[model samples]
Target: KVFERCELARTLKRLGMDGYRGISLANWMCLAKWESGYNTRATNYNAADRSTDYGIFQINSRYWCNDGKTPGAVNACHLSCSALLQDNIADAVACAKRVVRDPQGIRAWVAWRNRCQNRDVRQYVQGCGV
Candidate 1:
């Protein structure tokens, strides 16, 4: 499937992400709805030159692979959720946790809810509690 909500849910559960508590499945669905429009292959246009940024979360290709040459790669399955599917799930979770824990921004997942239309995953899952 082009998009895999079920797979996302199962993967999150397996990861023991506290981000799911108090969050309805529909709410979780809403996150994907806005982030990538449920499309793992979604990309957004760069504001500078209208160039495309790749992957579901719009992860730059440089960070997607260990290599730096593939800047605009387009394999969400190969890129998105990568930190979760790789040999070490903890690493990916840790990175994501840090993103939510970013003090300069929302500071707390609950605070980010205002930005995500009340669909931020950080609200349901503890950043690094697991």
Candidate 2:
């Protein structure tokens, strides 16, 4: 996942914080390590739904690749809930990119392992208005 995660991280970096952002690459990486051990194919069998949350980020299958874009679904440069059914590595990287573009931001992934809970990480995740 780290290798694939680098893809997402670089994508997010391209997005930039311009100052205020909630999560950092280090924070997200820490969470991924503990949450799924960097396994894009990792599915929490322990999840209440029992569905495979494909990718390193462990996004539930149902919401895997549905990026909610135009032309219905964009398999290219866009992600959605359905993306989970395919390659784990690709899905994981894609999903990470998706969250980086989400409006509410994605704290679940970063918060999971944020030991310091530094404001920088929090600002990054929360500041992301995409």
Candidate 3:
């Protein structure tokens, strides 16, 4: 699903993204916007590393979900990459929570570092009624 901005915001909030792992809802919103534009089925292939990033969070196969094709993957999220691509975001949300639990926190995504980090992210959740 390609979500409307405010709708996605409310949905994320309902899923407990507001302050999960000390990361704000706006920050997660920024990450999702920059990574997948709120599309549930979004995907990107990292040809250099031979891994694919999957879903709204763009969770990578190299260190997160397993696609059974990524070399030397860790699968720390303990699920198939297919789960990340589903329209039902429950699995994706669960995995995203597991992601920020890491030492990197939300910095696990480069898009967050380049675009969202220390930037004015309030606009992401502004007027969303979240």
Better of 2 and 3 by lDDT: 3
TM-score, every prediction: 0.43, 0.48, 0.97
lDDT of 2 by residue, 23-114 (tens): 55656655555566666555554255434444566664444454343223334334554554344345455566555566655554544636
**Best candidate (score: TM-score):** 3
Can you tell me which runs of candidate 1 are displaced by over 4 Å? 20-28, 49-53, 60-94, 104-116, 119-130
lDDT by residue for model 1 over 59-115, one digit each (tens)? Answer: 333333222234464332243433433434344434443444444322233322544
Clashes of 2: 20
Residue-by-residue lDDT tens digits, candidate 3, 7-82: 9888888889899999999999999999999998999998899999999999999988999999998898899999
Runs of candidate 2 with Cα error greater than 4 angstroms are: 1-22, 66-88, 110-116, 119-130
- The Cα RMSD of model 1 versus the native structure comes to 8.2
lDDT of 1 at 4: 54
Better of 1 and 2 by TM-score: 2
Minimum summed lDDT over a 10-residue window in model 3 is located at 85-94
